[PDB]
Amino acid sequence: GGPDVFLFPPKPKDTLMISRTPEVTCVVVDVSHEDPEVKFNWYVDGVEVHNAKTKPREEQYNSTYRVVSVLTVLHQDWLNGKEYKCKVSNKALPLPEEKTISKAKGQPREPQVYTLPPSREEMTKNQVSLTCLVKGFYPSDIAVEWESNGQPENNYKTTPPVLDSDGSFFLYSKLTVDKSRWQQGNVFSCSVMHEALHNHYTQKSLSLS
Amino acid sequence: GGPDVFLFPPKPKDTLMISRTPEVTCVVVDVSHEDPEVKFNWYVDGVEVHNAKTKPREEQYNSTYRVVSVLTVLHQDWLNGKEYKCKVSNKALPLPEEKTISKAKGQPREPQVYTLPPSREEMTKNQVSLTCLVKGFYPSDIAVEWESNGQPENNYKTTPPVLDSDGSFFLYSKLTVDKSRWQQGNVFSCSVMHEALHNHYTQKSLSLS
Numbered sequence: 001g002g003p004d005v006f007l008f009p010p011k012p013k014d015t016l017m018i019s020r021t022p023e024v025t026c027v028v029v030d031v032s033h034e035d036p037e038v039k040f041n042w043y044v045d046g047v048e049v050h051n052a053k054t055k056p057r058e059e060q061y062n063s064t065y066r067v068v069s070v071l072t073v074l075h076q077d078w079l080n081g082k083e084y085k086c087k088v089s090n091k092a093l094p095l096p097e098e099k100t101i102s103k104a105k106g107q108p109r110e111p112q113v114y115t116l117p118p119s120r121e122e123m124t125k126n127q128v129s130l131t132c133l134v135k136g137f138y139p140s141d142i143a144v145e146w147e148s149n150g151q152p153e154n155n156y157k158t159t160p161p162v163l164d165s166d167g168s169f170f171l172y173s174k175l176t177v178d179k180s181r182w183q184q185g186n187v188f189s190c191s192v193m194h195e196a197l198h199n200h201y202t203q204k205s206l207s208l209s
Numbered sequence: 210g211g212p213d214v215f216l217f218p219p220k221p222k223d224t225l226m227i228s229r230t231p232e233v234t235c236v237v238v239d240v241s242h243e244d245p246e247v248k249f250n251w252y253v254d255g256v257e258v259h260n261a262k263t264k265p266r267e268e269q270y271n272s273t274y275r276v277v278s279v280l281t282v283l284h285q286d287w288l289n290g291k292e293y294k295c296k297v298s299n300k301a302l303p304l305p306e307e308k309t310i311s312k313a314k315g316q317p318r319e320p321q322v323y324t325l326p327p328s329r330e331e332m333t334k335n336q337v338s339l340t341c342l343v344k345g346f347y348p349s350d351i352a353v354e355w356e357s358n359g360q361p362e363n364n365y366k367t368t369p370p371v372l373d374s375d376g377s378f379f380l381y382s383k384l385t386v387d388k389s390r391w392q393q394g395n396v397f398s399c400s401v402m403h404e405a406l407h408n409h410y411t412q413k414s415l416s417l418s
């Protein structure tokens with residue numbers, strides 16, 4: 001003992017696509033083997049909200065409870081900086097334990113997206129790297145994926161975002177393809193999601209030149 | 210109470226340059242306000258070693274001691290996977306608390322190093338990105354820097370290493386330069402240090418073409 005509260009954000013990309021339902025999740029742990037009532041109260045910017053889905057408590061293998069409250073936030077609200085208080089009242093807590101969360105703050109910056117060919121040097125090999133530079137973005141929440149005519153591409157990795165000398169973020173995502181696919185003339189396209197982009201999406205294509 | 214031991218590695222690049230003196234550092238904390246004797250014993254692969262520099266204990270502002278033992282390791286030994294035991298004997302510890310450390314294990318893989326020009330698209334701007342791809346390396350310990358004819362370059366950032374789909378590591382380092390420097394014909398050079406490279410160094414240059 002005693003109770004600890006953790007409040008978790010939605011996934012970046014559930015926030016970046018209107019077609020998705022982003023949730024903030026409120027988790028309470030160390031609720032006593034003994035005193036098991038827990039109340040949740042939830043607020044958006046101060047106004048109390050009554051829509052959260054609270055689950056029946058689950059007993060952990062360490063003789064302690066754990067209770068969860070999911071609130072669904074609106075695409076517009078989250079992106080618009082609204083603040084989300086989860087307030088947790090136990091009879092084991094002398095003051096309700098509270099926690100607030102919102103999207104990452106700071107002026108939004110729209111990423112520049114660049115696609116880069118394989119070096120003269122890589123062209124020896126039986127596989128090549130296609131490179132997606134994404135720079136000057138802010139905040140760091142981002143999703144990056146590759147696709148080729150319709151279906152997406154397996155063999156890609158993306159770096160975490162890195163903080164740049166101007167307070168902004170950059171990132172590279174590397175697509176690896178069979179050299180035969182690149183020389184054929186197959187179009188490849190790096191798609192980026194970020195809040196600051198129009199409709200939070202853009203896409204840059206790269207082809208054999 | 211009671212005592213906790215942390216054993217820290219050298220810096221990657223002190224390990225990658227023969228001209229440098231790499232140290233493993235053994236730190237003991239939570240040594241009691243009361244029982245202040247601490248003994249260190251140190252081993253390389255089992256054989257006890259007698260060369261470590263031990264500092265006089267420093268009292269922390271939380272009413273507790275902290276004592277440090279630095280051992281200097283040899284360039285050859287560290288790279289060669291030797292193991293470094295720091296053994297800590299307090300009278301508050303019913304068994305000596307021990308800790309071992311070595312270089313990251315696994316078969317070494319030599320990085321491929323590629324330099325990449327600015328996209329057709331970036332060339333509009335008054336600053337451009339020069340890109341250094343480093344891929345297929347193992348282990349992840351690496352140092353990457355840019356220089357231009359002699360002195361090094363300020364405005365660069367490098368991503369952390371990322372784990373690739375083949376168990377190896379890649380990384381990109383981005384140099385930003387004034388577009389006037391790039392068009393002049395100024396040579397730029399990405400230098401990489403990694404254990405698997407000949408003499409643990411290589412360097413790839415990039416120029417206006």
Ligand SMILES: *[C@@H]1O[C@H](CO[C@H]2O[C@@H](C)[C@@H](O)[C@@H](O)[C@@H]2O)[C@@H](O[C@@H]2O[C@H](CO)[C@@H](O[C@@H]3O[C@H](CO[C@H]4O[C@H](CO)[C@@H](O)[C@H](O)[C@@H]4O[C@@H]4O[C@H](CO)[C@@H](O[C@@H]5O[C@H](CO)[C@H](O)[C@H](O)[C@H]5O)[C@H](O)[C@H]4NC(C)=O)[C@@H](O)[C@H](O[C@H]4O[C@H](CO)[C@@H](O)[C@H](O)[C@@H]4O[C@@H]4O[C@H](CO)[C@@H](O)[C@H](O)[C@H]4NC(C)=O)[C@@H]3O)[C@H](O)[C@H]2NC(C)=O)[C@H](O)[C@H]1NC(C)=O
Pocket residue numbers: 001004006008009010011022023024025027029030060061062064066
């Ligand atoms: C008794 O047992 C309890 C647990 O039961 C089991 O736990 C098992 C793992 C194992 O141990 C079993 O044997 C055991 O039976 C145990 O409870 C645990 O207590 C810990 C605290 O003591 C908690 O640790 C915290 O973890 C946080 C990270 O939590 C995520 O990651 C962990 C590790 O991987 C993971 O296990 C958790 O489940 C959790 O995962 C995330 O959960 C959320 C919500 O479900 C998801 O979010 C949603 O995802 C869904 C997916 O459908 C959907 O997409 C939604 O949209 C989205 O919202 C995540 O996706 C999900 N991810 C994963 C990977 O599953 C840490 O953040 C936290 O660190 C913070 O606090 C620490 C102090 O304790 C400290 O180290 C650190 O400083 C840090 O600080 C805070 O956080 C801020 C960071 O932003 C800081 O700014 C601040 O400093 C500070 N915040 C403030 C303001 O205070 C911490 O380590 C652990 O969660 C909890 N376990 C569970 C399962 O809840 C308990 O402790 C045991 N008791 C005893 C007596 O010891």
Ligand SMILES: *[C@@H]1O[C@H](CO[C@H]2O[C@@H](C)[C@@H](O)[C@@H](O)[C@@H]2O)[C@@H](O[C@@H]2O[C@H](CO)[C@@H](O[C@@H]3O[C@H](CO[C@H]4O[C@H](CO)[C@@H](O)[C@H](O)[C@@H]4O[C@@H]4O[C@H](CO)[C@@H](O[C@@H]5O[C@H](CO)[C@H](O)[C@H](O)[C@H]5O)[C@H](O)[C@H]4NC(C)=O)[C@@H](O)[C@H](O[C@H]4O[C@H](CO)[C@@H](O)[C@H](O)[C@@H]4O[C@@H]4O[C@H](CO)[C@@H](O)[C@H](O)[C@H]4NC(C)=O)[C@@H]3O)[C@H](O)[C@H]2NC(C)=O)[C@H](O)[C@H]1NC(C)=O
Pocket residue numbers: 210213215217218219220231232233234236238239269270271273275
């Ligand atoms: C009383 O006060 C004590 C400290 O005094 C002051 O501390 C101040 C910061 C502040 O609090 C003051 O108010 C206070 O007065 C306090 O002591 C602290 O105890 C903590 C444990 O309870 C320790 O935390 C650990 O930290 C580790 C990281 O340590 C580095 O980073 C921290 C955070 O930045 C930094 O402060 C430390 O100084 C340390 O820095 C590094 O130090 C070494 C050696 O000096 C350097 O290495 C050398 O660099 C030199 C430079 O000249 C040269 O280049 C050499 O070649 C090179 O060797 C580093 O460069 C240097 N870096 C920096 C940034 O300075 C964490 O690793 C560790 O995490 C691990 O354990 C945790 C459990 O406690 C856990 O969270 C986690 O699971 C993790 O697990 C371990 O580690 C492995 C990771 O590889 C895992 O695999 C394993 O799970 C596990 N290992 C095993 C096998 O067990 C942990 O958090 C803290 O170091 C210590 N503070 C100091 C100053 O020593 C004390 O706790 C207080 N007591 C009470 C009653 O509370």
Ligand SMILES: [Zn+2]
Pocket residue numbers: 083100
């Ligand atoms: Zn607030």
Ligand SMILES: [Zn+2]
Pocket residue numbers: 110196197198
């Ligand atoms: Zn736009």
Ligand SMILES: [Zn+2]
Pocket residue numbers: 198199
């Ligand atoms: Zn529109």
Ligand SMILES: [Zn+2]
Pocket residue numbers: 018075079199200
């Ligand atoms: Zn929107």
Ligand SMILES: [Zn+2]
Pocket residue numbers: 292309
């Ligand atoms: Zn060992």
Ligand SMILES: [Zn+2]
Pocket residue numbers: 319405406407
């Ligand atoms: Zn070689």
Ligand SMILES: [Zn+2]
Pocket residue numbers: 407408
């Ligand atoms: Zn040689």
Ligand SMILES: [Zn+2]
Pocket residue numbers: 227284288408409
């Ligand atoms: Zn060497």
